[PDB]
Amino acid sequence: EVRTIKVFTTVDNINLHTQVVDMSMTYGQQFGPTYLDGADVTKIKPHNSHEGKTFYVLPNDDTLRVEAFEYYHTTDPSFLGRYMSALNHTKKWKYPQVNGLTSIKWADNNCYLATALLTLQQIELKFNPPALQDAYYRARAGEAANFCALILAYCNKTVGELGDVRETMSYLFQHANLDSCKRVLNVVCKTCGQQQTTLKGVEAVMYMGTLSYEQFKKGVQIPCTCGKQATKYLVQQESPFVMMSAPPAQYELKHGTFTCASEYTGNYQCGHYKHITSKETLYCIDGALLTKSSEYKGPITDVFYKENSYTTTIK
Numbered sequence: 665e666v667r668t669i670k671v672f673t674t675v676d677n678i679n680l681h682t683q684v685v686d687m688s689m690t691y692g693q694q695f696g697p698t699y700l701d702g703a704d705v706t707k708i709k710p711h712n713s714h715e716g717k718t719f720y721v722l723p724n725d726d727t728l729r730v731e732a733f734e735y736y737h738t739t740d741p742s743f744l745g746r747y748m749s750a751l752n753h754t755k756k757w758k759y760p761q762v763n764g765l766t767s768i769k770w771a772d773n774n775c776y777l778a779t780a781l782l783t784l785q786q787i788e789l790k791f792n793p794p795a796l797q798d799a800y801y802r803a804r805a806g807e808a809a810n811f812c813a814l815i816l817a818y819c820n821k822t823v824g825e826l827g828d829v830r831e832t833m834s835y836l837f838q839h840a841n842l843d844s845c846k847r848v849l850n851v852v853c854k855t856c857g858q859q860q861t862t863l864k865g866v867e868a869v870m871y872m873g874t875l876s877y878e879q880f881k882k883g884v885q886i887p888c889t890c891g892k893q894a895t896k897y898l899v900q901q902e903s904p905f906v907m908m909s910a911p912p913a914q915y916e917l918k919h920g921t922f923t924c925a926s927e928y929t930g931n932y933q934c935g936h937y938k939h940i941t942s943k944e945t946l947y948c949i950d951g952a953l954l955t956k957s958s959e960y961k962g963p964i965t966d967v968f969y970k971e972n973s974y975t976t977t978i979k
């Protein structure tokens with residue numbers, strides 16, 4: 665007896681492609697690698713309950729290649745498999761609302777993803793890939809499973825891997841519209857003189873070396889090629905936020921002097937992030953957990969500040 669069902673294949677879960685599948689054969693034999701809401705059904709034969717359902721496949725014809733690139737803005741061949749594999753886990757995570765923001769209950773070392781997600785909801789940022797636009801919209805509303813899986817895929821992290829918040833934000837920033845952002849810096853060595861530099865996009869909003877936006881404006885000491893120590897300070901800044909980062913060190917966060925920050929406790933190969941946000945008071949969101957304090961001191965590695973336009977006074 666020949667037995668078939670109709671299903672739909674997709675790469676973006678919007679554009680559907682009608683298929684007829686033979687119930688005596690696996691999905692793999694008919695589509696190649698096949699997924700049902702994240703689950704790998706490649707080695708599985710069609711079930712009656714599969715009729716009418718949407719299955720993800722890999723882009724193995726030109727029409728799917730174009731749909732996938734337009735939706736995700738990547739042509740990494742392993743992207744979709746990595747996204748599905750992550751999603752099969754992130755759809756089981758919980759996404760509690762904590763002080764008005766979508767967080768993530770701790771699981772699978774995802775603390776770095778929680779503080780990244782919490783941070784995104786406090787800074788002005790638009791993603792370019794439609795996949796991130798759509799998934800971020802849902803994540804804000806509370807259904808963050810697809811967004812978290814996409815973050816993992818874009819950053820080439822698997823569920824359970826330890827992540828770095830700064831690196832994760834770098835990847836997300838690459839897929840955001842920061843074209844308007846501009847940074848002008850000046851480096852002063854007393855043996856070589858001055859030298860001014862201009863940064864754009866992602867490099868205009870990220871700095872590594874100090875957590876303090878004010879100290880960045882006043883000046884910070886760095887090496888120079890002659891062996892002398894030079895001073896770098898901020899000449900001009902155009903962006904809706906800035907991100908200051910440093911290796912984790914004890915730091916004091918004051919209410920109303922910053923938007924949010926990331927705290928890291930542990931070592932290089934093992935640790936835990938928490939999120940601090942400055943609202944009517946200082947709230948520490950640790951996944952599903954919430955505490956408050958008027959003052960805060962702890963090992964801070966990233967601090968986020970609001971900005972529109974800043975011009976320096978140093979002549």
Ligand SMILES: CCNC(=S)N/N=C/c1cc(O)ccc1O
Pocket residue numbers: 723728729730731732733734735736737738739740741742743744
């Ligand atoms: C450079 C050769 N590939 C082309 S033009 N399409 N591939 C697209 C594509 C492939 C993936 O694995 C994931 C997402 C995608 O958008």
Ligand SMILES: [Cl-]
Pocket residue numbers: 707708709710
């Ligand atoms: Cl089966």
Ligand SMILES: [Cl-]
Pocket residue numbers: 753754756771772
């Ligand atoms: Cl899991």
Ligand SMILES: [Cl-]
Pocket residue numbers: 789790791792796797800
């Ligand atoms: Cl967006």
Ligand SMILES: [Zn+2]
Pocket residue numbers: 853854855856857888889890891892
């Ligand atoms: Zn010099």
